Symmetry: C2
């Protein structure tokens, strides 16, 4: 119950740290796209090795979706990431009182809204990840939700891998201090398939890594096909 | 063993007949593309309902792949479908003596070779399906391999759905006579995901249903995304 979930946070923290070492190596280093296709292979290898350690270790709803759309509309509204983190914090508390997919919607909606909005993410992804890290550290000093925070970080690392490549280490290091606070797959694989599409769209739409729309679509097709071939 | 496989040929024959009735209705009827997107939904619904009835019911290798490439090269070499069926019959016997994926390679390679070669299929798919049906009927008069033949027919119906839409009924009817001869999923789901890509490429490259390469790629992307949304 609590303990296997605790070591499950540990195993996801360890695999996120080891994939973070591989990601930090590619971050020291077309190199961003090398990191991106590497991150596609890394999401595939992460799902594989996490499966291996997993084996070894053991009408109001339509109103809700409309309020979620309005949440994205409010979400469209460096200091800007601080104000966005402030309102996202308050909206996260209100949404948690309202009831997860909502919290991922509130956090990731601004970033996906930017990536659609040109149709920033380096700074907003870094400040949202770092600010959730520093706010979690302030909570660790001052005091499932933890795996929610780390899964939001995995969405940060996996979905926005094309932005800043050193972002993987910055997750797990913070996460290990969460073990200190204790001391005092399906949504993830969905985020991974969406991360294959999202990192392909991050290279294709966001990155700048009548041909170009067609080649962006073709790279989405070929990278999805090759990264589906590997997995 | 033999019996549950026999009723499994029966259940695939029945579901192929019911999806064949739906396909015959769309065949009586942009209508080909309506049939194609319907066939994408039908492949998804076929996998779903087949899963439901499934629940209710119960270095020489590199030389081989090189010989398979040479088999495709020989494969590139209305009467033409008859000669192709003749050589494919002899090559099928030689390949079966040589050892399935090989037989699907030999049969489907000419059709996929055409669809790449412009980069026919109505007539070649109809004559290959009908000729395998008539040759199977001659075998039924004169006398796993059966599920191999029907899976080749499912590749015919599902992979080449954009060509001729009445092709679904023409499978199962012939298959039911195979029960008379008795009386006297993973490869399939792979063929289905390849059929989503293949029917999208059949509409996009083959059909004719600098924008057009981009919109063909976009229809492959959107139809793969929507047909993956449904499934």
């Amino acid at each position: 119950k609590i303990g296997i979930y605790f070591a499950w946070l540990g195993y996801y923290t360890q695999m996120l740290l080891l994939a973070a070492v591989v990601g930090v190596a590619c971050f020291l280093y077309f190199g961003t796209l090398i990191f991106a296709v590497f991150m596609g292979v890394w999401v595939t290898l992460f799902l594989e090795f996490w499966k291996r350690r997993q084996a070894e270790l053991e009408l109001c709803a339509s109103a809700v979706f409309f309020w979620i759309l309005l949440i994205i509309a409010s979400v469209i509204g460096i200091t800007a990431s601080i104000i966005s983190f402030i309102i996202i914090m308050i909206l996260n508390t209100i949404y948690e009182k309202v009831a997860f997919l909502f919290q991922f919607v509130n956090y990731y909606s601004s970033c996906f809204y930017i990536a659609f909005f040109k149709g920033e993410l380096t700074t907003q992804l870094t400040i949202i990840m770092g600010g959730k890290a520093i706010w979690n550290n302030i909570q660790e000093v001052l005091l499932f939700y933890e795996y929610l925070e780390m899964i939001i970080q995995f969405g940060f690392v996996t979905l926005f891998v094309a932005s800043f490549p050193l972002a993987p280490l910055l997750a797990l290091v913070n996460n290990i201090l969460e073990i200190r606070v204790d001391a005092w797959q399906p949504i993830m694989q969905g985020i991974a398939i969406l991360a294959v599409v999202t990192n392909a769209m991050i290279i294709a739409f966001t990155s700048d890594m009548w041909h170009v729309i067609a080649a962006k679509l073709a790279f989405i097709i070929v990278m999805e096909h090759i990264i589906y071939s590997v997995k």
